[PDB]
Amino acid sequence: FDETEIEDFKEAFTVIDQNADGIIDKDDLRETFAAMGRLNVKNEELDAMIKEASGPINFTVFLTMFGEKLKGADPEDVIMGAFKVLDPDGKGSIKKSFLEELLTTGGGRFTPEEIKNMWAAFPPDVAGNVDYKNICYVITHGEDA
Amino acid sequence: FDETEIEDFKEAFTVIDQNADGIIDKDDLRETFAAMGRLNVKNEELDAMIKEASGPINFTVFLTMFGEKLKGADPEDVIMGAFKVLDPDGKGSIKKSFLEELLTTGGGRFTPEEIKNMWAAFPPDVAGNVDYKNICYVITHGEDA
Amino acid sequence: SKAAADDFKEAFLLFDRTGDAKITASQVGDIARALGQNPTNAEINKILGNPSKEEMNAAAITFEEFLPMLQAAANNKDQGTFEDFVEGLRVFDKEGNGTVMGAELRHVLATLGEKMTEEEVEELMKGQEDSNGCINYEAFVKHIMSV
């Protein structure tokens, strides 16, 4: 965890903790979702978020919960560092079959089935290994941009 | 020591001296660490901080201890002054090999091994000598930002 | 002689990167220049070889060899006459005003005789040549003899 990433989680903690007392309760979760447009947010969704913690969601409990789910989270500059080492001549997005072979043949984390899931929402270019960069974006901030 | 840097150490001395009597004892160290989130701060860490002084930690003993550890501490504006003289055309971060050659070939403090340690937590850009400015930040205030 | 100038020994401690009080034979040319002596690089080369000293293999030094080599180079400072430096460049460009066109002095200083790198040539013209492309060598040779 770099310090600017921890400051981003402190700002997200303050936007969900609308009572500003330092502990995100279930009313803060529901009022942050209603301010984003969720008028139908069920109480069972709020209870499942609170069921991931052993205590009240203060800043260090929110940081330890996000730490334990993001144990391989990598910032965009280090993902582009590794993709610039995979394309060491610069500019070009690397081939689809080169990333499939190098993921498998180096590591067990790069096994195929997982490579079909990589192509599956990370579209073609991303999946193929040709573009580059959009995948670093969606690994640090999810969903389609 | 510029006077605003001495006022920053006076403000840090007042935040660690929670009894406000002018001398930071071991109880102040433990209660400042507990207010930052350190519930498990051992007494041996507090004793090792007090073992760096020959007397009680008043404001001038805290300033002389920090002076003797920071005998080459440079403010961010003077580090950016020197990096603007290394990049005299402005804007561009300077090359990795140019900073390695100029550190070694001018001075013994710029020897290589030390240059591998510079690249080692000061990441690539910083290490390489391309970016600039993030290294001035972390030399005046440590750890990842 | 001492006049025993002990600051030559203090400057040898500023050029020795290992702190063992020895200076390699490849640094001796530039340190004779930093002590106020301008021997040409062929002269520094000859003297070395003259004494069956090879600058091709690893070298160390001792102060006891560097002191007499600086004292053998110190007699040759009578070759530094500024009349011939300004008259050299006065024969290098037409008309009665001391101006070399930029690229004439840069290509001559890099390729004629003892090769100076184009990085060092740009560092010696920086400030004395403005955007007209004309180097005034009356002030240029004055500032080169100020160091």
Side-chain angles (χ1 to χ4, degrees), chain C residues 58-142:
Chain C
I61 296 207
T62 85
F63 168 70
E64 292 83 21
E65 302 167 276
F66 202 152
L67 187 59
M69 293 186 309
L70 179 67
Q71 301 172 287
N75 311 303
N76 309 323
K77 66 178 297 298
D78 298 334
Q79 185 190 264
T81 159
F82 73 101
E83 253 76 37
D84 295 84
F85 297 146
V86 177
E87 292 161 341
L89 296 172
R90 182 60 61 130
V91 175
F92 188 46
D93 45 91
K94 41 73 192 60
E95 292 185 76
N97 189 266
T99 48
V100 182
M101 303 178 60
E104 294 177 323
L105 203 160
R106 298 190 302 237
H107 298 151
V108 164
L109 190 58
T111 71
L112 291 182
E114 301 190 337
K115 308 286 184 173
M116 302 301 176
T117 78
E118 189 62 39
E119 181 182 21
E120 293 166 315
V121 177
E122 294 166 27
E123 297 162 335
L124 294 171
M125 313 310 309
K126 180 179 55 183
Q128 305 108 308
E129 177 181 16
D130 67 264
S131 69
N132 62 350
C134 297
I135 312 164
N136 185 273
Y137 51 74
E138 302 167 81
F140 166 69
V141 173
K142 180 182 305 178

Side-chain angles (χ1 to χ4, degrees), chain A residues 26-143:
Chain A
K26 182 183 180 185
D27 308 278
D28 292 283
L29 295 169
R30 187 189 310 122
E31 297 170 85
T32 299
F33 290 145
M36 299 302 174
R38 297 193 51 91
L39 183 62
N40 47 41
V41 49
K42 300 188 301 293
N43 301 110
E44 288 87 4
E45 303 175 40
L46 308 170
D47 296 326
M49 301 173 185
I50 299 178
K51 189 182 180 60
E52 300 170 328
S54 181
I57 303 290
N58 58 59
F59 186 42
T60 67
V61 170
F62 203 38
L63 288 176
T64 54
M65 189 181 62
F66 260 85
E68 296 163 30
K69 300 182 284 79
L70 295 174
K71 301 184 61 180
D74 198 71
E76 291 175 324
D77 302 277
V78 183
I79 316 177
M80 296 181 62
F83 285 142
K84 200 69 173 187
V85 175
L86 295 177
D87 186 76
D89 68 305
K91 298 294 181 179
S93 69
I94 191 177
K95 298 181 77 280
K96 170 182 180 181
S97 69
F98 190 97
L99 289 183
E100 299 170 322
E101 294 164 330
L102 188 58
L103 189 54
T104 303
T105 66
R109 297 180 182 180
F110 301 88
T111 89
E113 184 188 88
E114 286 167 312
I115 299 177
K116 299 168 186 176
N117 299 340
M118 296 303 176
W119 271 111
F122 271 130
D125 297 0
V126 180
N129 300 300
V130 184
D131 189 308
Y132 216 91
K133 312 187 176 178
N134 303 332
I135 301 180
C136 305
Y137 275 28
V138 183
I139 289 179
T140 302
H141 52 83
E143 83 183 84

Side-chain angles (χ1 to χ4, degrees), chain A residues 2-4, chain B residues 143-145:
Chain A
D2 67 82
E3 184 177 277
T4 299
Chain B
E143 83 183 83
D144 299 280

Side-chain angles (χ1 to χ4, degrees), chain B residues 43-62:
Chain B
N43 301 110
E44 288 87 4
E45 303 175 40
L46 308 170
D47 296 326
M49 301 173 185
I50 299 178
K51 189 182 180 60
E52 300 170 328
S54 181
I57 303 290
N58 58 59
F59 186 41
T60 67
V61 170
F62 203 38

